[PDB]
RNA sequence: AUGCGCAGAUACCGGGAGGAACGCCGAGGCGAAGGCAGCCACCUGGUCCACCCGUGACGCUGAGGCGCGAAAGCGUGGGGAGCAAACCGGAUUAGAUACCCGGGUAGUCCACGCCCUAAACGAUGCGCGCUAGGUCUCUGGGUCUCCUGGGGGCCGAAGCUAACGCGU
RNA sequence: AUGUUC
């Protein structure tokens, strides 16, 4: 699982400001742990399709977030799926 | 008879140790007693049978002793 | 698994190759305990005595340790898993902390880096050869000897294996491989584990060849022969037996048993 | 020929028949009846009769063991489970103890059809 | 790393010859998984509910450790290689949950 | 009756194997559905509540597409105790290609890959708001004799309904 | 236990 230590390492690495928790980036950062963290245990266990259905939901969610990011601020869009390693 | 939580005192029902304790919740066959007999809340007769269980396979108490006269 | 092939080919849309995955680990064989020249030579002194053999590739033997006991107490290390042309099983060879090398047949699970060991006193793991007697009954159990002393006879083709069913004076019982329900002398050898590359018996040959390559040439059915040849010899176009069906040299081939009647070995037989 | 005063008697009473084994107390079966030792065919095996018949019959055969004592072991639901447990208690042998001991998986084999009319 | 209690039961037929064997089998075994001992609890003999390996009695031990949580399977798998060690149960470590106040 | 049984069965006891399913707890609970039941550990998804802390409409639905999808069934392997289509026997019958009995092969189990159906049902698409209450129940929160949220039931206001019924 | 039709 991911750790509280772990969590708030990422979310530290992509608040907009201190004490920021939520917020697209650090939603989408926070996602991308969960869907790497998922992926891989998929990777071993491909016949477990009920946590598959959680991952198709954060993918899907994060790619609704991208889309409003990408559609309010499109520099931070960029700035953030760089940073990140995703939309590929 | 009486319920048998009214019976004991201030008991951890995770210790599945407490073989003292948890035999009385067992029936004279082994089973494990239905509310109506512990008198327990759902929610803890089933952190009840989780470590009844347990302690079944540490060999602290039985799945099955037998009934005795008809 | 078995290594399938698209039908490029004919004959190769059936084929199916043994996985050598178990084995590559030693590809060509030990140089000290490999060779033996193996004879070839399909009958006797002469004549054919069994139908059928002849061609088929050339073949160094592998001599391969069916008693264990010369070794009581010598550990030796599984260097390698390889491929034995003269038997359905593949073959380890061990290194005895001794120096000395020998081959075992390969137990399933045998893995190479493991330990193994021979005697009384012998843990009850995979590919460790003690006497009957000391080894738990259940326990499933490949390369028996069948009477003490007289090296292993029994479940040793790919895949095979016996299960102690009890004890039962100086003897055991062994389920053998055929369902047979046999006593066995609790002095005789055995080795823990089954035979493996189970996969063995489901490899199609896929062709005419192939069996030739394995030694086995043309069978031909006795039907199809002149009378002079064989009892199903003859009759004008095609034929039935028209006789109870019969060997060439006319014994009956369907049902009517053969081993001998008084046999000594049979008070120790049972299915 | 051997001699055991206290031992076990078994009763499994199916509901096809009724049978005791009466053993030493290491359970090594010392004499056994059943619904058709005595007379009985068929149906009848199973009635409760038969199960009174059956244990004393069984009961009788262990004298010539001087058995005197036994703790009896019930195995069944089925008719001849009650008689052939009145049967003992007033049969000259002194019942030590009653115990059902009836065998019950703890949701195991699939059963028969005819078992599983079952949900 | 998370707190585990790791239950042992052990032939009851030792003498302490024998038991310590075990006993340093298990803390080397332990220590080797990277097991820090917390608390530590040789209730020691007691007749069991039912026979185990035949046997009318264990002798009971219970370690409370702290393990990476990764390595607490392997961990019960070498605990239960040895003969005389008959159960190895073990158990996330919990809150305890009561009832009456 | 077939069948098993004097080559010693049945019942009892000891030793062992092996497969399948988990009694009591156990009614409720979880999941989008299919569905999910011993215990332990690791990996992992959904979900509820509280603080009211962060973002600031980022939302609803969704033709196609993608994935999941009981049982049977198919392919390659494994496994095979119990059960058991087909099948063999015994009965029943006017016949009995059935129902009842004794056996029995696929299959039922596992891995991988297919199939993609169903009374796949609440025969009720999803989301949101609004319109009496009472009562039982699961699971959070509470200056806790009641309040407050999330679920599951039964009865019912208004209203709807061909009716049956539905009814926060 | 079975036990058809108009
Ligand atoms: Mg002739
Ligand atoms: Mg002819
Ligand atoms: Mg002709
Ligand atoms: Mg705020
Ligand atoms: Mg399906
Ligand atoms: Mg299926
Ligand atoms: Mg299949
Ligand atoms: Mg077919
Ligand atoms: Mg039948
Ligand atoms: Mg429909
Ligand atoms: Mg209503």
């Known amino acids: 699982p991911i750790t509280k230590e772990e969590k708030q390492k990422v979310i530290q690495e992509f608040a907009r400001f201190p004490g920021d928790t939520g917020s697209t980036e650090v939603q989408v950062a926070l996602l991308t742990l969960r869907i790497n963290r998922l992926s891989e245990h998929l990777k071993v266990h491909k016949k477990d399709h009920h946590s598959h259905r959680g991952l198709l939901m954060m993918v899907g969610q994060r790619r609704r977030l991208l889309r409003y990011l990408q559609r309010e601020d499109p520099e931070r869009y960029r700035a953030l799926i760089e940073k990140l390693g995703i939309r590929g | 008879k009486a319920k048998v939580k009214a019976t004991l005192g201030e008991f951890d029902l995770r210790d599945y140790r407490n073989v003292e304790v948890l035999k009385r919740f067992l029936s004279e066959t082994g089973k494990i007693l239905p509310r109506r007999r512990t008198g327990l809340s759902a929610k803890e007769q089933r952190i009840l049978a989780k470590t009844i269980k347990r302690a079944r396979i540490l060999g602290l108490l039985p799945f099955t002793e037998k009934l005795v006269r008809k | 698994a078995v290594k399938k092939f698209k039908p490029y080919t004919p004959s190769r849309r059936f084929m199916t190759v043994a996985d050598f995955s178990e084995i590559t680990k030693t590809e060509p064989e030990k140089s000290l305990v490999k060779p033996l020249k193996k004879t070839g030579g399909r009958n006797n002194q002469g004549r054919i005595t069994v139908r059928f053999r002849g061609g088929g590739h050339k073949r160094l033997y592998r001599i391969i340790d069916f008693k264990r006991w010369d070794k009581v107490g010598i550990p030796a290390k599984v260097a390698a898993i390889e491929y034995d042309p003269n038997r359905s099983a593949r073959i380890a060879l061990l290194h005895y902390v001794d120096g000395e090398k020998r081959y075992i047949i390969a137990p399933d699970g045998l893995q190479v880096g493991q330990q193994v060991v021979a005697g009384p006193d012998a843990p009850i793991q995979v590919g460790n050869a003690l006497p009957l007697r000391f080894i738990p009954v259940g326990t499933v159990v490949h390369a028996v000897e069948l009477e003490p002393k007289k090296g292993a006879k029994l479940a040793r083709a790919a895949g095979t294996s016996a299960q102690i069913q009890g004890r039962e004076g100086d003897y055991v019982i062994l389920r053998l491989p055929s369902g047979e329900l046999r006593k066995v002398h609790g002095e005789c050898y055995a080795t823990v584990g089954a035979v493996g590359n189970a996969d063995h018996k489901n490899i199609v040959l896929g062709k005419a060849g192939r069996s030739r390559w394995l030694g086995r040439r043309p069978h031909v059915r006795g039907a199809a022969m002149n009378p002079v040849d064989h009892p199903h010899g003859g009759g004008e176009g095609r034929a039935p037996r028209g006789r109870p069906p019969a060997s060439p040299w006319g014994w009956q081939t369907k049902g009517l048993k053969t081993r001998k009647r008084r046999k000594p070995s049979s008070r120790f037989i049972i299915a | ?119 | 790393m998370r707190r585990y209690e790791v239950n042992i039961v052990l032939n009851p037929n030792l003498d302490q010859s024998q038991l310590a064997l075990e006993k340093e089998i298990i803390q080397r075994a332990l220590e080797n998984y990277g097991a820090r001992v917390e608390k530590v609890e040789e209730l020691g003999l007691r007749r069991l509910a039912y026979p185990i390996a035949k046997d009318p009695q264990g002798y009971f031990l219970w370690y409370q450790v702290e393990m990476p949580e990764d390595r607490v399977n392997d961990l019960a798998r070498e605990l239960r290689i040895r003969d005389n060690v008959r159960r190895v149960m073990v158990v996330k470590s919990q809150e305890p949950f009561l009832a009456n106040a």
């Open chain 4, 1 to 119: 020929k051997r001699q055991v005063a206290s031992g076990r008697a078994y009763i499994h009473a199916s509901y096809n028949n009724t049978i005791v084994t009466i053993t030493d107390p290491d359970g090594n079966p010392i004499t056994w009846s059943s619904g058709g030792v005595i007379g009985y065919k068929g149906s009848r095996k199973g009635t409760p009769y038969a199960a009174q018949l059956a244990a004393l019959d069984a009961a009788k055969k262990a004298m010539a063991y001087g058995m005197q004592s036994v703790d009896v072991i019930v195995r069944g639901t089925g008719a001849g489970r009650e008689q052939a447990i009145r049967a003992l208690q007033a049969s000259g042998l002194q019942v030590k103890s009653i115990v059902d001991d009836t065998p019950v998986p703890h949701n195991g084999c699939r059963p028969k059809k005819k078992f599983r009319k079952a949900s």
